[PDB]
């Protein structure tokens, strides 16, 4: 649905090559950070190291960089949709999701499950054992 425009890709290319010391087209972890800070963000040591190893020495070219930027777009869109869904699942707006609320919303979404199956999903996502699923437990449940 949501994809990178030609304008964004061109800007990513200019930010990539602006901090590429050689003409190889492959930047390091340290150079990747400067690129990120030029794009209005501020990742840390581990974050930069996790990003560079997710798209494969510790160096990446632009096609791999664009892949990483696309995944960021995919993740940030999923993050808000999960945030959107939580407000929908939380029918009374108390900040928690009961088994009754889960079963009701699932019905409207063409998902007819037994009362036992609903209890299982709640039991599976309930970490602190309050009986209901809050936002933190909901994110882990949706991310998987």
């Amino acid at each position: 649905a949501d994809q990178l425009t030609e304008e964004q890709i061109a800007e990513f290319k200019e930010a990539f090559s602006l901090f590429d010391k050689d003409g190889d087209g492959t930047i390091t972890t340290k150079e990747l950070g400067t690129v990120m800070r030029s794009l209005g963000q501020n990742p840390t040591e581990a974050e930069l190291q996790d990003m560079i190893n997710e798209v494969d020495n510790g160096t990446i070219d632009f096609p791999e960089f664009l892949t990483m930027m696309a995944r960021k777009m995919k993740d940030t869109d999923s993050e808000e949709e999960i945030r959107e869904a939580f407000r929908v699942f939380d029918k009374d707006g108390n900040g928690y999701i009961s088994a009754a609320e889960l079963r009701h919303v699932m019905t409207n979404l063409g998902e007819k499950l037994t009362d036992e199956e609903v209890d299982e999903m709640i039991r599976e996502a309930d970490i602190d054992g309050d009986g209901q699923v809050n936002y933190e437990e909901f994110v882990q449940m949706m991310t998987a």
């Binding site: 999923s78 999960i82 063409g110 949706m142």
Partner: peptide
């Protein structure tokens, strides 16, 4: 009539068992 969710929606990915 149930709601129609986009294929790239996390909720539909929750439908997957």
């Amino acid at each position: 009539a149930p709601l129609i969710l986009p294929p790239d929606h996390p909720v539909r990915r929750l439908f997957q068992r």
